[PDB]
Subunit: 314 residues, 3 copies
């Protein structure tokens, strides 16, 4: 199978600059070369150049709508392109608003895909419910079929078509949900595993259940959108919105190893790595290294070890 | 339901001055304001002023017996008062000896209550078994019916009436038990989950079993006495007796979330926060913050989120 | 029962100097004295003085083969001696290559022993598969009967006799396995619990299965070879090969308590503690304290507490 890396050095979805440096830091850490060591064919598409929309006035509370909408339209085009050729798309953020383009493009080719969202947040604030006009906290609102017409059309997003329903998404790691968002997920009946279900069940059973929920009836492509703040700040401190009490490095790797085993991974997002938010160089290195480890894990790297087939090492 | 915060700025139960500042630090961190945002009606009763007993000579090894006994008599009077009017009492320590008064007063109104003690310690040393005369390590000895007359009467504690039996208490988090205390818990058949049972069972099953043990036959009010050293020093470093290998921030929140769900929480103690023991201001901040988080969780704050009823956020 | 402490201040099994200081650091922390407080009789045999083999030319890739072979021949003699007298041998490393003599010696007396190997690494590289000629990463290759004749004879190891088979060893904590080693364990059918099985099952069920696997049929002497890097670097940072995502302090203690409860502990190795690799004095203190705690745990110290039998504490 083929892997295509696409860097989305974008940050207008939130107020903290620096996430645009994310793809660079990940490449600098040897992400691409380490992936070539796996059984996959790797092709680096490079970073996308995002044109800045001048005079991008905020829409009500929503900041940089046009700049975010345009960058996402462009990303969706690139992703649909790679997906069409039958390759696996790996997007390196950038803030989480880029999931709009990533998932949209992916869904054009695989309309029946399901999404596993790993994040401390639901990121499902609608333009009417946000306390800040920050779009990184609103991706899922733009993708749900059930949220269509429940919020005014935003400048720059008219190309978007709600591709997935409430039945096709599962959240893992939740621990910082606004009252509005919580209202939404309860009302829509969206399956989730907050830190409390993880604590109650253990990560092993959490994965068993998300799989029987999403793949029980039909086997379909999986899109894993991974916000690095889903792990505890001790492992991924260099992020914009760290929340204590998160998934451990072990649980994170467990998630990715189980996904790899399904043989159904189709799209992957490694989002919110912000190299400029590390208090010490080691905090940055810690964050990058774990992002890299999770990516490699999605593609076969096992903790029990790996050996090349047909090679008699004796 | 109504909540009433009662501060017990007392420290004579142990040698390290500082726990008296506990209530102030917790209020300073916005505990009361954040509690008002919940569905509960909150009333801050202020801090109790304890009269110092001059010439408080030690009773054998037992230090400050009269000061501790008197402060507890006054606290018991206050708690019995609030409980009577049908409100939930929340005591902010202060060292753990104040549990004598908090639980005594609570039992005057709800004689059939049960106690869930979260601590790294059993705090069940009798005046005869203590290696130090410190009363913060002896609360439970004074409250147990099965321990009546097994130790000489102490000056200042004649008002105390053993209110709960060995069948009504469950310990969680044990990892530092003296040989004597160990002998007592084994002999009396007290249900406990030391760190090894937590490790073996997982916090989810630990809670399931404590509830089936304490509420299996009769549903009765619950008194949760929470010693902050029950959690690992990594989370609550600002305490007088930190012991490595404790409960995680996650397990602590899981305990409080499950207790909230029973609908039976009647009394709560947040003990042993000592602001002066932090090696760095961040250490004190870390400690206070988690204490606040545990309190809020007892009253409904969930990690999956919360939304006000009847409010259509769309 | 009797315990005999044997110090193995040896470091030629790997490139980083400092592990020889391991035994001194452990003794300085009061290990021997703390052991005497347990129900066991303790005899400290002191530290073995290892004769350095001049002109120890590498065997192909393999470094210091003769020095390592000789130090291990001498250690095996000592251990066979103490085991013969019916005492429990406790070896203080020193690098993990010393497990060759430690297990060899033990097996001469107890041929039916089983081995529980706690380590991040399988340490099963053969002289032909090592990327570095370091012998600390090859102990098990020399002990396995199934690996006899699969690699050339090494200068200094002619005295070694493969004592255990693939059926007698269980690995716990694996998270850094070379391709070659992974091929070997998979081919030979060796039972193991990598961090992913630990995540999936929980330390409790992991221990239940290693016991039914090794002792289900015949109860036999247990040799526990413990490499301190088996625990996460947060607990044991002063080692030569730290790998993130390891066993916690709590899981490590759980392992030792369960082993203690079997009543079959016969031999114990506490390897890889390197004092000179701590970045701050505290890091060395943290490493030493947890190694001491694990040792005392094997010999009865429980987290729920201990009380001396026949002493009425009331
Ligand atoms: Mn996100
Ligand atoms: Mn997030
Ligand atoms: Mn206490
Ligand atoms: Mn305590
Ligand atoms: Mn190792
Ligand atoms: Mn080793």
């Amino acid at each position: 199978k083929p892997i295509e890396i696409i860097g989305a050095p974008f940050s207008k979805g939130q107020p903290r600059g620096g996430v645009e440096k994310g793809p660079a830091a990940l490449r600098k850490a040897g992400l691409v070369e380490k992936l070539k060591e796996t059984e996959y064919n790797v092709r680096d598409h490079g970073d996308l150049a995002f044109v800045d929309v001048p005079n991008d006035s905020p829409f009500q509370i929503v900041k940089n709508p046009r700049s975010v909408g345009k960058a996402n339209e462009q990303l969706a085009a690139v992703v649909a392109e790679t997906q069409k050729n039958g390759t696996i798309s790996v997007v390196l953020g950038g803030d989480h608003s880029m999931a709009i383009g990533s998932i949209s493009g992916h869904a054009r080719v695989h309309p029946d895909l399901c999404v596993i969202w790993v994040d401390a947040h639901t990121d499902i604030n609608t333009p009417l419910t946000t306390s800040s006009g920050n779009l990184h906290g609103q991706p899922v609102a733009f993708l749900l079929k059930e949220l269509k017409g429940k919020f005014p059309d935003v400048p720059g997003f008219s190309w978007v078509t709600p591709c997935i329903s409430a039945k096709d998404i599962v959240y893992i790691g939740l621990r910082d949900v606004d009252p509005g968002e919580h209202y939404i997920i309860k009302t829509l009946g969206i399956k989730y595993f907050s830190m409390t279900e993880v604590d109650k069940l253990g990560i092993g059973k959490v994965m068993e259940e998300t799989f029987s929920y999403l793949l029980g009836r039909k086997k379909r492509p999986i899109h894993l959108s991974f916000d690095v703040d889903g792990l505890d700040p001790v492992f991924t401190p260099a992020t914009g919105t760290p929340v204590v009490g998160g998934l451990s490095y072990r649980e994170g790797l467990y998630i990715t190893e189980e996904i790899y085993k399904t043989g159904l991974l189709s799209g992957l997002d490694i989002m919110e790595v912000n190299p400029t938010l590390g208090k010490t160089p080691e905090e940055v290195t810690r964050t990058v290294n774990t992002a890299v480890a999770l990516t490699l894990s999605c593609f076969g790297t096992k903790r029990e070890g790996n050996h090349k087939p047909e090679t008699d090492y004796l």
